[PDB]
Amino acid sequence: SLEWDNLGFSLLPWIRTGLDVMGFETMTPVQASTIPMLAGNKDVVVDSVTGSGKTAAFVIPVLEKVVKEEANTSKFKKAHFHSLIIAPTRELSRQIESVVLSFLEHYPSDLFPIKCQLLVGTNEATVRDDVSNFLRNRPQILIGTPGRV
RNA sequence: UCCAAGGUGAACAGCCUCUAGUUGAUAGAAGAUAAGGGAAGUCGGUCCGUAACUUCGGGAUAAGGAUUGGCUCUAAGGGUCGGGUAG
């Protein structure tokens, strides 16, 4: 069908709003076959061509799992995180973080926020600055390259 | 019943010596080989000449007499400072 409305688990309204504002006009086969299972107690091994909605295909289930496991609540502890994302290069991880930020643009207010932090090797921030703002801001998503993470 | 040196042997062994003990035992004099035959007998016969190898650590980074510079991505690689022309 490739329609967002007739998916198995009825995606969250703000994720749907973000998708509609971004568009895509539909859901790709990768996003149609991965999102229902990656949020449904199944590990996922996905091979797909470049630029086929893969990034959103693994970003939407991440946010769904974050909301599902009550990660965006006062009960969540300090110095803890929920989800990790790893990429082999710094630019790819920064691009993934930009996609996540674009999705979280339409996150509603009046609720405990969901944030992300990028951990890449940079000359503008030591690892101790990363630890300091991780403690202060308390994100639930970490995105970075293997060395700095 | 206790203690127990060294060197050769380079096969327990045997041989020689260091420390330590002996000179004790009546005294003096004056098995091996074989020519020829070969059981005819009797009851009974380790060291000289080659070649490859070969021990311990530390080392990382393709080498180690030469002109050393040596892959892609990926935490850190001592600290600090410093940017023009005009009003």
Return the domain boundaries, chain A: 13-149
Spatial contact of A100 and A141, defined as CB atoms under 8 Å apart: yes
Q: At what angle do helices A54-68 and A29-38 cross, to 10 degrees?
A: 20
The resolution in angstroms reads: 3.0
Which among A148, A142, A103 is positioned nearest to A122, based on CA atoms?
A148
Distance A47 CA to B46 C1' (A): 75
For residue A77, the 8-state DSSP code is P
CA distance A89 to A60: 22
Method: cryo-EM
Buried b / exposed e across A33-49, counting CB within 10 Å, b at 16+? ebbeebbeeeeeeeeee
A130, closest nucleotide (Cα–C1'): B75
Nearest 5°: the CA angle A93, A24, A12 is 80
Integer Cα distance of A29 and A124 in angstroms: 40
Instruction: Kindly report the number of other CB atoms within 10 A of residue A31's CB atom.
Output: 26
Give the Cα separation of A71 and A92 in Å (integer).
25
Protein-contacted bases of chain B (C-beta within 7 A): 73-77
Nucleotide nearest to A119 (CA to C1'): B75
3-state DSSP call for residue A80?
A: coil
Strand partners, A144: A86, A119
CA A109/CA A17 separation, integer angstroms: 14
The protein side of the strand B contact, defined by CB less than 7 Å from any of its atoms, consists of A 88-90, 120-123, 126-127, 144-148
DSSP classification of residue A81: -
How far, rounded to the nearest angstrom, does the alpha carbon of residue A112 sit from its chain's CA centroid? Answer: 16
Superfamily of A13-149 according to CATH: P-loop containing nucleotide triphosphate hydrolases (3.40.50.300)
Three-state DSSP class for A119? Answer: strand
Across all strands, nucleotide nearest A93 (CA–C1'): B74
Radius of gyration of chain A (CA): 16
Q: Give the whole-angstrom CA distance, residue A65 versus residue A49.
A: 25
**SS3 of residue A94 by DSSP:** helix
Please give the angle made by the CA atoms of A58, A63 and A66, to the nearest 5 degrees: 125
DSSP strand pairing (A116-119 vs A141-144): parallel
